[PDB]
């Protein structure tokens, strides 16, 4: 529903990257974090392609003595991950509505079983 | 509460790596993933030190067509790559120590930018 235009933006932005190469192992990702969770929720729903899959929204730990929500985006190759980092950054500049998420590229040693 | 014995195992195991070393930035972590949430929950509650902080349990995606176990995971954020591997060992010790605990797969994590954890 609400995350739909954002989805199409990434759809043509990522281009070839969205399609999945069965050989590549899921070893990199992009973590987005902000204070407004529903924004991340729409980001999570938007980044759903064969080649780029976002996990659900969750938190980072903070010592109690404001919650920080985050969403992890998993991508087949390091090249793609940077692209996702740009993709959102473009949307943020493109659409003034969208809040400004901080982010960081993620590097896994051992691959993950996203598929097969 | 139920993850008290597990917490104390790590408390002594990690030793000084549990401390802050405040100069350090958080750019490393360890992702644990398996098919049993509540084991990961207990892990998450156990890993809670000044130098090692675990996020809550979450999932990894799967595609609609794929038959899947609905695997869950927890991130364990750290000071340095030094602590991150130690974390990986710490859990493996507990897994070999206590046969009860299901054997989680895991992976050391590396971040580009530091995360806001202080
Ligand atoms: Mg803006």
Author numbering:
A (entry chain E): 1029 to 1093, 1097 to 1147
B (entry chain F): 1029 to 1146
What does the paper say about this structure?
Among the very few genes expressed during latency, the latency associated nuclear antigen 1 (kLANA) is the dominant protein expressed in all KSHV latently infected cells. LANA is required for the replication and maintenance of the viral episomes and thus is essential for latency. kLANA directs the replication and tethers the viral episome to mitotic chromosomes to ensure efficient segregation of the newly replicated molecules during mitosis. kLANA consists of 1162 amino acid residues divided into at least four unique regions, comprising a proline-rich region, a central acidic repeat region, a putative leucine zipper, and a dimerization and viral DNA binding domain (DBD). The distal C-terminus DBD is self-sufficient for both dimerization and DNA-binding. The DBD binds to specific sequences present within the terminal repeat (TR) of the viral episomal DNA, termed as LANA binding site (LBS).
Here we report the crystal structure of kLANA DBD forming a novel non-ring structure in the crystal packing. The structure was resolved at 3.8 Å resolution in space group C2221. The kLANA DBD structure determined consists of amino acid residues 1019–1150 with an additional two amino acid residues glycine and proline at the N-terminus resulting from the 3C protease tag cleavage. The asymmetric unit consists of four dimer molecules. The central two anti-parallel β-sheets of two monomers form a β-barrel dimer by burying several hydrophobic residues with an average buried surface area of 1123 Å2 per monomer. The three helices α1, α2 and α3 from each monomer flank the core β-barrel structure, α1 and α3 is involved in the higher oligomerization (see below) and α2 is proposed to interact with the DNA major groove. The tetramer interface forms a bend angle of about 102° between the two dimer molecules and is related by a crystallographic two fold axis. A similar interface has been reported previously but the angle between the dimer–dimer interfaces are 96° and 74° (the corresponding reported bend angles were 90° and 72° (27)) forming octameric and decameric ring structure, respectively. In addition to the bend angles, a greater rotational angle between dimers has been observed in the present structure, indicating more flexibility at this interface than previously known. With respect to the non-ring crystal structure, the relative rotation angles were 26° (octamer) and 14° (spiral). This ability to rotate may facilitate kLANA's cooperative binding and bending of DNA.
